[PDB]
A = this chain, B = another copy of it.
Amino acid sequence: TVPDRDNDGIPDSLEVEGYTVDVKNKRTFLSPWISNIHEKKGLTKYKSSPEKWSTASDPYSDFEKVTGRIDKNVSPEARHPLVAAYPIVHVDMENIILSKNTISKNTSTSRTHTSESNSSTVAIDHSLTWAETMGLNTADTARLNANIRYVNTGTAPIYNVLPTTSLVLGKNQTLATIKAKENQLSQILAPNNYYPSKNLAPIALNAQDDFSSTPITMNYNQFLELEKTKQLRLDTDQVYGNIATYNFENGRVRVDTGSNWSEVLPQIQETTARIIFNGKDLNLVERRIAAVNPSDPLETTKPDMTLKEALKIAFGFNEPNGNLQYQGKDITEFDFNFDQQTSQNIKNQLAELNATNIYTVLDKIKLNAKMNILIRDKRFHYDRNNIAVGADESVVKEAHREVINSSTEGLLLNIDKDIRKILSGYIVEIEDTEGLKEVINDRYDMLNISSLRQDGKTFIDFKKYNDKLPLYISNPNYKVNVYAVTKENTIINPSENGDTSTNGIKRILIFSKKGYEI
């Protein structure tokens, strides 16, 4: 006799008005919101669409979510019916091995995003000719082998199936594509996880795998483009598999063949506001929240969502002092970016709000469906793929204030883990009492001089590239300078005319002490 239009578990009125799940005597109770009681217990005030089995358009009912009768791998924040539960899989390549039909360097992959499937970008180690180390003429062709592992940075787990990925050497130069492995992993890939696990062995990338008798080649021009722009791109799709559903009778999560991720994903993308936020580790985290779509009755059945409330339920912002903030960071320490559509909309709101600064009317900005929003730490500069590649000199400098130990063999400093993410290496030089300068590790591939102690502190080794001897300063009246190189300022390859000196580098003074001071 109770109204349950969408036929989940929650009665209409409850969803529209506000509700919450509460355990009393070891038993759960789906109660309506009661400020007296539920506010003190610190439960969450949920609210969903009485006409949508899943407000977020995902394979989990608003009931299964809030109630916990769901696959335990669905991310916490996505237990809220306004937060979408779907997977986000991209490929992480750890290192490459090059050779002619040899060399090997480490590679850092980071997930990317541009204003327009999940794509990741690989950065190959430029520090310590490639063409020489291998013996390459304009007639030879190089082969490619790399180690990779799939990464789920979403809010839902995938099971039976694994995505298709392609390795791209430019704008479209596809070197090899990894087939959509049918069911070669009954093992699960859950949110914030690597397959294969970190403690296990990586996946070997050896050939465009439709016929294992054909390696990944790369003619001399291709190879050179790779050397020129030490970087590959991994474009992964959304060919995830079946969804694991909860059986109300025995509570078993089994991989249902009826529910498939490709039946759902399209709907999610069309009825949610996408927000990407790099507050945790400068990594781009993407979340989707359910927003009203004015021209859609069914989507107007969804609760009204404000930008401020989205940030709280999606990424974890809170107001300890009435002031909104992440982890000790006021919302002002971040930067909002929108596509044209959202841009105009937000502007039209700020218009009808008579407000000039969006940071004040944050709880008054309405999120619609299909909105794309980008929040990123205001301290850093960002590239094409929205990756932290630098910062202001006042920032980078300040990041090296704590000088633990000064030595003629190196420096021991305590550096923010945030800042050290944007540094490419260090440059050491000697400055005579009057004018004379002279770089020691004077190579683009020899900035590789900083080691990270597992006790938080960073160590800068001077004598690394200086023939294993400390600084022989025959005159204790000179200066010892240590500059820093940001990813954006760094050179990864000799210029047009094979120049390999720091002479052409933008550096930031970090440490400048005379000889009698060390």
Interface residues of A (CB under 8 A from B): 5-7, 12, 15-16, 21-23, 25-28, 49-54, 57, 59, 61, 66-69, 71-73, 76, 79, 114, 116-117, 119, 147, 157, 166, 168, 171-174, 180, 186-188, 190, 196-202, 204, 235, 237-239, 244, 249-255, 259, 262-264, 266-267, 270-271, 295-301, 303
Give chain B nearest CB distance to A39 CB in angstroms: 17
Interfacial chain B residues near A66, Cβ < 8 Å: 297
Which residues of the other chain, B, contact A49 by a CB distance below 8 angstroms? 26
Q: Which residue of B lies closest to A201 (CB)?
A: B172
A235 CB contacts on chain B under 8 angstroms: 200-201
Interface centre among A22, A171, A202, A262 (most CB of B within 10 A): A262
- Tell me which residues across on chain B come within 8 A of A53, comparing CB atoms: 249-252
Residues from chain B with a CB closer than 8 A to the CB of A297 are 21-23, 28, 66-68
Closest chain-B Cβ to A90's Cβ sits at a distance in Å of 13
CA distance A67 to B7 in the complex (A): 17
**Given pairs A26-B300, A26-B303, A27-B51, 18 additional interface contacts (CB within 8 A):** A6-B251, A7-B249, A16-B26, A26-B301, A53-B249, A53-B250, A59-B252, A67-B298, A71-B266, A72-B267, A72-B271, A73-B266, A117-B197, A166-B201, A188-B266, A200-B235, A253-B264, A253-B267
A187 cross-chain contacts in B, Cβ below 8 A? 117, 237-239, 262
Which residues from B are CB-within-8-Å of A190? 266
Contact, CB under 8 Å: B26 / A199: no
A21 to B294, CA, bound (A): 12
Q: Min CB distance, A253 to chain B, in Å?
A: 5
Distance in angstroms between the alpha carbons of A131 and B157 in the assembled complex: 48
Q: How far is the CB of A220 from chain B (nearest CB, A)?
A: 16
Q: Complex Cα distance A239/B71, Å?
A: 19
Chain B residues, CB < 8 A from A15: 26
Which of B68, B188, B253, B299 meets A299, CB within 8 Å?
Answer: B68
Q: State in angstroms the CA–CA spacing of A253 and B190 once bound together.
A: 24
Chain B, residue nearest A258 (CB) = B254
Chain B residues within 8 Å of A22, by CB? 297
Of B117, B249, B300, which one neighbours A200 at CB under 8 angstroms? B117
Give 13 A-B contacts (CB < 8 Å), ordered by A residue: A26-B50, A26-B303, A68-B296, A72-B267, A72-B270, A79-B295, A79-B296, A116-B199, A117-B197, A117-B200, A171-B201, A254-B263, A255-B263
